[PDB]
Design a protein around this ligand. Structure first.
Ligand SMILES: *[C@@H]1O[C@H](CO)[C@@H](O)[C@H](O)[C@H]1NC(C)=O
Ligand SMILES: *[C@@H]1O[C@H](CO)[C@@H](O)[C@H](O)[C@H]1NC(C)=O
Ligand SMILES: *[C@@H]1O[C@H](CO)[C@@H](O)[C@H](O)[C@H]1NC(C)=O
Ligand SMILES: *[C@@H]1O[C@H](CO)[C@@H](O)[C@H](O)[C@H]1NC(C)=O
Ligand SMILES: *[C@@H]1O[C@H](CO)[C@@H](O)[C@H](O)[C@H]1NC(C)=O
Ligand SMILES: *[C@@H]1O[C@H](CO)[C@@H](O)[C@H](O)[C@H]1NC(C)=O
Ligand SMILES: *[C@@H]1O[C@H](CO)[C@@H](O)[C@H](O)[C@H]1NC(C)=O
Lengths: 201, 596
């Protein structure tokens, strides 16, 4: 029939500011029509790697909920946003499950997220005692204890601060330039699936 | 938990914050160099002070991790690099005195202005006022005046300063568990802890003497030929049996002999390989020069330049309104930012310099995957040697014919190869005894073998013995004749040029054997050869993570610096010089026979 109430993909992709990789934003998308061909046919994305589903049948299938996680990482750290990978981002900042169904979309944002003095507003968790579970968020700012001595809240010897900034400057290499990453997670649950694609007339 | 994991986390935090601070400092230095303005000087000084204070604090914090409880070689290498005191082990008064002495030597060398007595209304600085006179004049007393007046002013200013300098640097070095400052400089080649590939600080002097003993016949024949030609140029001053007069070598100090190519050319009637007019006729921009260099590096299989390289480099002189340093410099600013600062003209020299500096950039790009404190050459010789091999390969007539800059009907006979090899010998072979003699003299000064009242009596004795160059008039101990040169007056190691020269031809033989070149070594071109680039990039990707002996094993298959590739490179010229020196006398006499 006549279709209205599109899913809010404009408030995820065209957001004026993105979150850091550690405090990554999660938006739950429900009870609307999700047109995925608008995203797939865009020329503005550098990575559109879909895991567990193909992009051509996304516009056909129907899902219970869509999770849109948004953050900013480096150019060389986009490869770690994948199932089964390793690195600071996967181990300490944002972990994807091995049984992940969804798409990882990344694009260069050197125009927006880099300033000539250095943009220190984007941070990443550099240390933690254990690796993250999938879809876990750690926003704690407690001093990492690398040694036997207690930190006692002061960043002294062997005690460092967990979150470190990426001083994004426009003159950086393509592996150090900021990349905005949106990860869409598609799950089907026993509830009635309501995020369906548009149906042709 | 364990000390090693603690050191690894400390290195990770170090790396992360260091990379950012080094970037800020390098960008400030770039903005000073492309824009000489006082606020850029202030920003450079602020960034440099922050970088130095951060290195002091991390050196103070790295020492708390003892070395013997760490088994991983790379972690131990980074911790060894970080844990050096430097001048921090010295007292604050003496450290301030040493810094003041270094700065005032820099100002004396940079702002040294000398002109003729009784005509003092205007004077000429060293660059380019005295450089052009030394490189182009044919007058004996004019060159003698310039040489003696510049060593009078500069040496009589710098002699007490250097006497304080040697004592302070020896005090710092013995405070850093070295024998002298010469041992501190030789510690760059020290490899410890690797089975078989260990290299000692004491092995460096023995290897340098052992290689120079094989250098010596080729240099003796070249010296005899240059002596005969300078006797033709200056009829009565030069003796057939004696050393060369010091002020006639084409440069201020005798560092290079490349300004004597006009006087000492074998076959003037034959043409040169100058391609300047050919680029002017085809209207080659400096952008085209760097694009041809990039085409050379992609032909061998190395990665091409980033977009940020073309956006952010200054490859042309900006203009009259904006001032910039004219010296060509390759900048690894950090965070994947690679730039070249060169005021490129349309000449062969600037084209070869573009190849040389892009070789520096390729070397910097290759070890970008390494941790920050391991992002260097394996020693100080490799970093310059990998640029000089590109300068070797690009200068060949096959490369010029391949890129269209030389006529395809250019006749490559033996005479042009002889005079090309002689030009390369005046540049390359002639600097070797001067470099070796200067470093051996500085090592003997730091070791205390030479007392302060006998510095110059030994020095000229060394120059007659090694370089075969005699002083015009005797100098007493009020002179400081070594410190008129840039590197010695500004606290720089000088053995990097000797090691660079030998590593250059070792790398050239290894890559030409990889490229299956079937002719003479100087006729060899490494373009279009993927395997030569792969053999190069295997060493290039290591950086400072591996010992320089193991890197040299990776390229040439030898564990030590070798002299045979250089002698193989100059073998046509060596046979030609042996033929031309039948009537004349090879070797020199240390007596005062030419002039004293
Ligand atoms: C985001 O912005 C681009 C460029 O302005 C636009 O083409 C696109 O339609 C916008 N929305 C989405 C969902 O990408
Ligand atoms: C160089 O510095 C001057 C100083 O005011 C400035 O006006 C100019 O824009 C600078 N040049 C560049 C290329 O930034
Ligand atoms: C040394 O540490 C690095 C990480 O810093 C690791 O990749 C490497 O495998 C280690 N080497 C050894 C021999 O343990
Ligand atoms: C650096 O100096 C301190 C004291 O000045 C000393 O304890 C330390 O051992 C020195 N480091 C090295 C590597 O010698
Ligand atoms: C470098 O080479 C790659 C692959 O050949 C090419 O896509 C890229 O555009 C080149 N870089 C530049 C700056 O031309
Ligand atoms: C060059 O070759 C010719 C013929 O082989 C020979 O007569 C001449 O002497 C050679 N010249 C030199 C400098 O080797
Ligand atoms: C090297 O490769 C380029 C591109 O294929 C080619 O134009 C050039 O002629 C080659 N060099 C030689 C010596 O043939």
């Amino acid at each position: 029939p006549n279709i209205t109430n599109l899913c809010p993909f404009g408030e995820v992709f065209n957001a004026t500011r993105f979150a850091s990789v550690y405090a990554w934003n999660r938006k739950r998308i429900s009870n609307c029509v999700a047109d995925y061909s608008v995203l797939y046919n865009s020329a503005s994305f550098s990575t559109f790697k879909c895991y567990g589903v193909s992009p051509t049948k996304l516009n056909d299938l129907c899902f219970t909920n869509v999770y849109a996680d948004s953050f900013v990482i480096r150019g060389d750290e986009v490869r770690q946003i994948a199932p089964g990978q390793t690195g600071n981002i996967a181990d300490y900042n944002y972990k994807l499950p091995d049984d992940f169904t969804g798409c990882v979309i990344a694009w260069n944002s050197n125009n927006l997220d880099s300033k000539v003095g250095g943009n220190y507003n984007y941070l990443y968790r550099l240390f933690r005692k254990s690796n993250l579970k999938p879809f876990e968020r750690d926003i704690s700012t407690e001093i990492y204890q690398a040694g036997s001595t207690p930190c006692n809240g002061v960043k002294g010897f062997n005690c460092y601060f967990p979150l470190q900034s990426y001083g994004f400057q426009p003159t950086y290499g393509v592996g150090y330039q900021p990349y905005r990453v949106v990860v869409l997670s598609f799950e089907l649950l026993h509830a009635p699936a309501t995020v369906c694609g548009p149906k042709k007339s | 938990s364990t000390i090693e994991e603690q050191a690894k986390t400390f290195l990770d935090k170090f790396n992360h914050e260091a990379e950012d601070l080094f970037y800020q400092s390098s960008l400030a230095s770039w903005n000073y160099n492309t824009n000489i303005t006082e606020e850029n000087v202030q920003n450079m000084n602020n960034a440099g002070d922050k970088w130095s204070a951060f290195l002091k604090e991390q050196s103070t914090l790295a020492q708390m991790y003892p070395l013997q409880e760490i088994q991983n070689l790379t972690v131990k290498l980074q911790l060894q690099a970080l844990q050096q005191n430097g001048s921090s082990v010295l007292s604050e008064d003496k450290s301030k005195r040493l810094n003041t002495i270094l700065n005032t030597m820099s100002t004396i060398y940079s702002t040294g202005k000398v002109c003729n007595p009784d005509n003092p209304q205007e004077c000429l600085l060293l660059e380019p006022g005295l450089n052009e006179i030394m490189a182009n004049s044919l007058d004996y007393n004019e060159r003698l005046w310039a040489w003696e007046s510049w060593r009078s002013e500069v040496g009589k200013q710098l002699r007490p300063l250097y006497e304080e300098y040697v004592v302070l640097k020896n005090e710092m070095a013995r405070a850093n568990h070295y024998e002298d400052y010469g041992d501190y400089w030789r510690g760059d080649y020290e490899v410890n802890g690797v089975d078989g590939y260990d290299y000692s600080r004491g092995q460096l002097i023995e290897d340098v003497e052992h290689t120079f003993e094989e250098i010596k016949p080729l240099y003796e024949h070249l010296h005899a030929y240059v002596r005969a030609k300078l006797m033709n140029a200056y009829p009565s001053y030069i003796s057939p049996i004696g050393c060369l007069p010091a002020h006639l070598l084409g440069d201020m100090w005798g560092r290079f002999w490349t300004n004597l190519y006009s006087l000492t050319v074998p076959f003037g009637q034959k043409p040169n390989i100058d391609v300047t007019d050919a680029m002017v006729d085809q209207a080659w921009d400096a952008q085209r020069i760097f694009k041809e260099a990039e085409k050379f590096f992609v032909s061998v299989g190395l990665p091409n330049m980033t977009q940020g390289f073309w956006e952010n480099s200054m490859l042309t002189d900006p203009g009259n309104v904006q001032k910039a340093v004219c010296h060509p410099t390759a900048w690894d600013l950090g965070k994947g930012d690679f730039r070249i600062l060169m005021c490129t003209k349309v000449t062969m020299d600037d084209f070869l310099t573009a190849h040389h500096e892009m070789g520096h950039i390729q070397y910097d790009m290759a070890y970008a995957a390494q941790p920050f404190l391991l992002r260097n050459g394996a020693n100080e010789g490799f970093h310059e040697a990998v640029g000089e091999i590109m300068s070797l390969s690009a200068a060949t007539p096959k490369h010029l014919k391949s890129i269209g800059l030389l006529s395809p009907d250019f006749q490559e006979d033996n005479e042009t190869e002889i005079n090309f090899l002689l030009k390369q010998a005046l540049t390359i072979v002639g600097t070797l005894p001067f470099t070796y003699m200067l470093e051996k003299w500085r090592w003997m000064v730091f070791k205390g073998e030479i007392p302060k009242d006998q510095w110059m009596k030994k020095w000229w004795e060394m120059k007659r013995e090694i370089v075969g160059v005699v002083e015009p008039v005797p100098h007493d101990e009020t002179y400081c004749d070594p410190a008129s040169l840039f590197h010695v007056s500004n606290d720089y190691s000088f053995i990097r040029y000797y090691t660079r020269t030998l590593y250059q031809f070792q790398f050239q033989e290894a890559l030409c054997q990889a490229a299956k070149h079937e002719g003479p070594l100087h006729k060899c071109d490494i373009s279009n050869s993927t395997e030569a680039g792969q053999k190069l990039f295997n060493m290039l990707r290591l950086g400072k993570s591996e010992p320089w002996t193991l890197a040299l094993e990776n390229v040439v298959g030898a564990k030590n610096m070798n002299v045979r590739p250089l002698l193989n490179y100059f073998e046509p010229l060596f046979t030609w010089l042996k033929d031309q020196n039948k009537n004349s006398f090879v070797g020199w006499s240390t007596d005062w026979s030419p002039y004293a």
